[PDB]
Each structure stands twice: as C-alpha cells, then as structure tokens.
C-alpha cells in the first residue's frame, strides 16, 4: 500500500534462531599403483613397468 505521505513503523519484534550447514572436508584416500592393476603377479608388474 504505497503512498507519498504514509509510513509503517514496527511495534514489536521476534528473536529467531536459524541453522546453516556447510561441508568442510571429505574422506582422504590412497590407492596402490600395482596391487590394484596387477595384484600379486611378477609378470604383470614387469609389464606395468
């Protein structure tokens, strides 16, 4: 309800508490180069070389 001589002033107030969730980190992982590809095989490790 806009007017050029009218204003609205709040009388009361409410105190509200909100929640915000933010990821910070993820799991750390390691991979074995040889045991994933040529697991326990001298021939396959030689080929992978």
């Amino acid at each position: 309800a806009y007017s050029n001589n009218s204003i609205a002033i709040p009388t009361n107030f409410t105190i509200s508490v909100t929640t915000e969730i933010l990821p910070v980190s993820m799991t750390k992982t390691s991979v074995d180069c040889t045991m994933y590809i040529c697991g326990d095989s001298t021939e396959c490790s030689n080929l992978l070389l």
Binding site: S30, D32, C33, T34, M35, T42
Partner: protein
Amino acid sequence: KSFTVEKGIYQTSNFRVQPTDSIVRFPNITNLCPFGEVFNATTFASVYAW
C-alpha cells in the same frame, strides 16, 4: 623414484615379501588316455558322418 627423500611421511607399497616356493595340487588320476588306441584304429569315419 629418487635417490633422496625429503622430510615427511610417505605411503610405500609392496614391502617385498616375494614368494620363493611353488606348489602343485592335482587329482589322483594316474591311468593314461588311450590316444594310441584312438589313433591306431583300422578305419576312422567318413567326414559326413564324423
């Protein structure tokens, strides 16, 4: 893959426990297949009636 390593903690792999024994386990069959009897037959077959 370097002759010098810096300070820190490094993930190693394959701590070189290389096997040194080889074993074989086979069933108890001992008689030999009759390849000589199969190959020694007087007549084998016709190709259309193999």
